[PDB]
Design a protein around this nucleic acid. Structure first.
Ligand SMILES: Nc1ncnc2c1ncn2[C@@H]1O[C@H](COP(=O)(O)OP(=O)(O)OP(=O)(O)O)[C@@H](O)[C@H]1O
Ligand SMILES: [Zn+2]
Lengths: 660, 304
DNA sequence: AAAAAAAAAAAAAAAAAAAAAAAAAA
DNA sequence: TTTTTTTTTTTTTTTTTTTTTTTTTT
């Protein structure tokens, strides 16, 4: 037997042969199993044991292992994995399955093999800087998905049969990029016809994708580069055409006759076999964080969620934690939080569908940090799409029709509203936009679907998306002596579809200006860029978050994701008379004096906001406090969009409902 | 056979989900119980996709070895009491039926099938009418009615579970010194609890949930349900029950029901507008106005 | 001398549908 | 001024068929 000290010295003048030796491969497996079983973090809890426990619960087929953990301890194995992926991964999958069969015996009846997904590889390359020295090694490459072939079954253990000797050949592992070539018989001793051994075989899922370089990475004015990526089983359909992705994989080469024929030199083709996939569409928090999905939670994190969810005033802290560095504008923050958490969709007897998402509009003076709030919402949301003004078209926010280059049949392609299904679409400068482009979202805002009838395609899509829009008033500035209908160009059909409207006014006030200036100067002071040091960095970065954020942002992201995924509150016991009276009063005080369209569509927004406030508390039932808070929000959103003449009377008239 | 709800006419996951004993032992009404059930199914070796198939079309190999899988795994989660022996009847090329499933189908047929005095009279007439529907299902010629009863039982158990989770999450059960009160005034589908059998179903769910609770007490429970059309509460008293798997040292003549004498004592002394006319003396119909005072008197009545 | 296997030989193109620009006007 | 109008720009080849005529290969 060998020791971790003995793996340092190498023989055979090649690392692959050194790894594949029988004596070395027995020490490697034992060391990998010890790493899997005995690793503990700072708090003292084994992480891979918990991951294995969750694997069986979720009926998963893959295990995620961080490269930093295996590099910090047993760094020689980390170097071996870095240089020689193919041989290390076969052993590591086997040891992973052996470790898994210590928590779930008889798990082989569910899945027969456990795959390992590597995460947080240190060195990141671009497609432009790939050379021949990276051949047969693990690489990390960012790109943009362009085209996807589709899922087909592929042979796994290939068999052959020869007729004159009737010989059956042993199973062959297919390279997945090179056809199995066999010409010699162990029995026939000569060339013979070979069959595929019809039936009695094992298949795998296979797919192929093309990655172009991201426009941001490409130097301005230069042509992009592309490469081909092969996705095997458990990795199919994860990436979608149009998204931006980061892939960790193995860089390989193969001989192509056409490439040699056209160029005129013995050049080879290259392709990447994908190992790990991470989505980066809309994510600017990629600067930090560890893992393949930063919106996923562990068991202790869920327990912490349920612990902090029962504190009184959780809603106040959640609201205060929205865009902490922006000063004031608490109504905007409340509307943003309500939109982010969202309502509950409904279907009554399978024939009547009711939408459950909140849309927000921000109409305000220039220089009031609306765009920064939109950027914060983009960063925090799980799925987010951004658009602005004249840069969007009718079919750029909807589905488009294209001729498939391969199949040559008319096909549907995605858009901004489809890329943000169960997400958020943000539209900055929503008033500086063509009417034909603006009117394309009428169906998606309410019916949450898209219908296309073009070139023989008659289909209906699904876009369960929420819209937060920012606009400027006529003349660039809001006239408080005029009603709303003469401060904007939008008509009733599009104004009715919005749930919350926030009018932002800039007024002269010495104390307010002094406080805002002090806050902004302190913020600029804070953001100036000037045990293990890598954790000293974390503690210093947490100290700065302590002042202005009641809860950390990374915790809040997982909190929002868990709340949206798991909770579905109901409305069993509530006061119908109060809501009916509020709706009737709001309808009466609109035609008499007002220019804010109120229909039945605004009655349901109160219930949606109540369900959102219930979601904020991780409660399964809506209480009276949440409904009262929703009524107060709706009433304050209507009173503050009036003329200065009647606002004082309307506020007094509507004040009886919001007694608390 | 097993203490599972309609095993041979539904999936395995459904049988484990809608069982009183499993729910009591694992607390499935919240997320932790569901996660524990998923972990159990993962450990046992049955894929989650296979456990959700119909019993007839379930994999033959899994069905053959179900007994060993139960025996070797059920002990870890405290569910070793679900294994028992029963009676199964088969007639030709038709299919097997157990006694438990038959009685649940009959009870489902009893429960649902087919100026306030007339309103109550029509309800009682319909309850009388359901008797012949349950009677017909005992004849071998009428099997479609038995299948209809099975479907009705599944729907009824789903509704009972849905109401019970709402009762348990909002802490509607009030712990008084002498008894525990539960009054259902608001919510959906309160028109199913106008029948005594459905209220007994919900009470059996709640008592089963309370018996396996670590809290050691034997207080009787009171369950009240409103009917808007009649403006009357239907009120039932339920006796406590020992845990199913508990030893025989406490075994005796079971806990006695003392609600009949208390109700008669309160009714005789005061001119309350109560109706004690059912065969079961523990079920009464009290007008809406009299509920809150009457219960107060019960608090001082004693014998509970 | 007599078998089994393996390529050449393509060619072709107008006619229509959808989407984004760069010039016209009530 | 925001409406209508207008040119116009790639969109194309991945497939076929059994003879007929060549090289290998017992
Ligand atoms: N409390 C605050 N109110 C307004 N602006 C603030 C505040 N704190 C900081 N700022 C800064 O003021 C600047 C103005 O913000 P921003 O550019 O979003 O304004 P805007 O007029 O809403 O933008 P746009 O026209 O792009 O929608 C930003 O640099 C922002 O960071
Ligand atoms: Zn052979």
């Amino acid at each position: 037997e060998l020791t971790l000290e003995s793996l340092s010295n190498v023989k055979a003048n090649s690392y692959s042969e050194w790894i594949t030796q029988p004596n070395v491969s027995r020490t490697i497996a034992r060391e990998l199993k010890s790493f899997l079983l005995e690793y503990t973090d700072e708090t003292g809890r084994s992480v891979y044991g918990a991951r294995i426990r969750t694997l069986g619960e979720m009926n998963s087929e893959s295990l995620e292992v961080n490269y930093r953990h295996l590099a910090e301890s047993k760094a020689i194995l980390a170097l071996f994995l870095a240089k020689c992926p193919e041989e290390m991964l076969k052993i590591f999958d086997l040891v992973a399955m052996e470790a898994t069969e210590l928590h779930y015996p008889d798990y082989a009846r569910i899945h027969s093999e456990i795959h390992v997904r590597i995460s947080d590889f240190p060195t990141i390359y671009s497609l432009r800087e790939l050379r021949e020295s990276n051949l047969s090694s693990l690489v990390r490459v960012t790109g943009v998905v362009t085209r996807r072939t589709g899922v087909f079954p592929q042979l796994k253990y290939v068999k052959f049969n020869c007729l004159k000797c009737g010989s059956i050949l042993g199973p062959f592992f297919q390279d997945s990029n090179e056809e199995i070539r066999i010409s010699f018989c162990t029995n026939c001793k000569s060339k013979g016809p070979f069959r595929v051994n019809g039936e009695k075989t094992v298949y795998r899922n296979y797919q192929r994708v093309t990655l172009q370089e991201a426009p941001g990475t490409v130097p301005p004015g230069r042509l992009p580069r592309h490469r081909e990526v092969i996705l095997l089983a458990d990795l199919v359909d994860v990436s979608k055409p149009g998204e931006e992705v980061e892939v960790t994989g193995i860089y390989k080469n193969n001989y192509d006759g056409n490439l040699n024929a056209k160029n005129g030199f013995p050049v080879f083709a290259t392709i990447i076999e994908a190992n790990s996939i991470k989505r980066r569409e809309g994510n600017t928090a990629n600067e930090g964080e560890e893992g393949l999905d930063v919106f996923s939670w562990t068991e202790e994190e869920e327990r912490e969620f349920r612990k902090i969810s029962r504190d009184r005033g959780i809603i106040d802290k959640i609201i205060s934690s929205m865009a902490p560095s922006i000063y004031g504008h608490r109504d905007i923050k409340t509307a943003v939080a309500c939109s982010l958490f969202g309502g509950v969709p409904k279907n009554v007897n399978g024939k009547h569908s009711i939408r459950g998402d909140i849309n927000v509009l921000l109409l305000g003076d220039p220089g009031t940090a609306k765009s920064q709030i939109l950027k914060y919402v983009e960063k925090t949301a799980h799925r987010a799409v951004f658009a602005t003004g004249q840069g969007a078209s009718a079919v750029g926010l909807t589905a488009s029709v294209r001729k498939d280059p391969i199949t040559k049949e008319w096909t549907l392609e995605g858009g901004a509203l489809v890329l943000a299904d169960k997400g958020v679409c943000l539209i900055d400068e929503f008033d500086k936009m063509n009417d034909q482009d603006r009117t394309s979202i009428h169906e998606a805002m309410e019916q949450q679907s898209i219908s296309i009838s073009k070139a023989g395609i008659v289909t209906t899509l699904q876009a369960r998306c929420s819209i937060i829009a920012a606009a400027n008033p006529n003349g660039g500035r809001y006239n408080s002596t005029l009603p709303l209908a003469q401060n904007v160009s939008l008509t009733e059909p599009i104004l009715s579809r919005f749930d919350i409207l926030c009018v932002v006014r800039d007024l002269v006030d010495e104390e307010a200006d002094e406080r805002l200036a002090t806050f902004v100067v302190d913020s600029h002071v804070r953001s100036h860029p000037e045990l293990n040091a890598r954790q000293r960095r974390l503690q210093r970065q947490r100290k700065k978050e302590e002042e202005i954020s009641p809860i950390p942002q990374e915790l809040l992201m997982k909190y929002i994701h868990y709340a949206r995924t798991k909770i579905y509150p109901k409305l069993h016991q509530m006061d119908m008379d109060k809501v009916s009276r509020v709706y009737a009063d709001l309808r009466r005080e609109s035609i008499s004096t007002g220019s804010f369209p109120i229909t039945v569509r605004h009655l349901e927004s109160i219930l949606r906001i109540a369900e959102s406030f219930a979601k904020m508390r991780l409660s399964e039932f809506v209480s009276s406090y949440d409904l009262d808070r929703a009524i107060k929000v709706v009433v304050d959103s209507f009173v503050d969009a009036q003329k200065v003449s009647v606002r004082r009377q309307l506020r007094r008239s509507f004040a009886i409902y919001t007694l608390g | 056979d097993y203490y599972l709800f309609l095993l041979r006419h539904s999936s395995l996951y459904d049988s484990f989900y809608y069982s009183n004993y499993v729910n009591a032992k694992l607390s499935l009404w919240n997320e932790n119980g569901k996660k524990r059930l998923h972990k159990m199914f993962a450990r046992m070796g049955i894929p989650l996709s296979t456990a959700q198939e119909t019993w007839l079309y379930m994999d033959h190999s899994i069905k053959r070895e179900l007994g060993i899988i139960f025996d070797k795994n059920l002990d870890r989660y405290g569910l070793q009491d679900i294994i028992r022996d029963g009676f199964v009847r088969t007639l030709g090329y038709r299919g097997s039926i157990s006694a438990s499933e038959f009685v649940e189908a009959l009870t489902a047929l009893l429960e649902v099938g087919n100026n306030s005095a007339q309103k109550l009279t029509n309800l009682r007439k319909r309850w009388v009418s359901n008797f012949w529907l349950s009677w017909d299902a005992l004849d071998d010629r009428k099997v479609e009615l038995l299948n209809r009863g099975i479907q009705l039982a599944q729907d009824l158990q789903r509704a009972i579970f849905n109401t019970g989770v709402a009762i348990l999450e909002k802490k509607l059960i009030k712990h008084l010194r002498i008894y525990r009160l539960c009054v259902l005034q608001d919510g959906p589908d309160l028109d199913l609890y106008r029948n005594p059998l459905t209220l007994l179903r919900l009470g059996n769910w709640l008592i089963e949930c309370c018996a396996e609770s670590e809290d050691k007490q034997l207080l009787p429970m009171v369950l009240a349900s409103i009917d808007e059309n009649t403006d009357t509460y239907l009120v039932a008293g339920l006796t406590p029950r020992y845990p199913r798997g508990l030893d025989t040292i406490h075994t005796k003549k079971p806990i006695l029901n003392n609600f009949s004498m208390a109700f008669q004592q309160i009714t005789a002394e005061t001119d309350a507008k109560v109706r004690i006319d059912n065969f079961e003396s523990s079920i009464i119909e009290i007008r809406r106005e009299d509920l809150s005072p009457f219960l107060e008197k019960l608090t001082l009545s004693g014998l509970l």
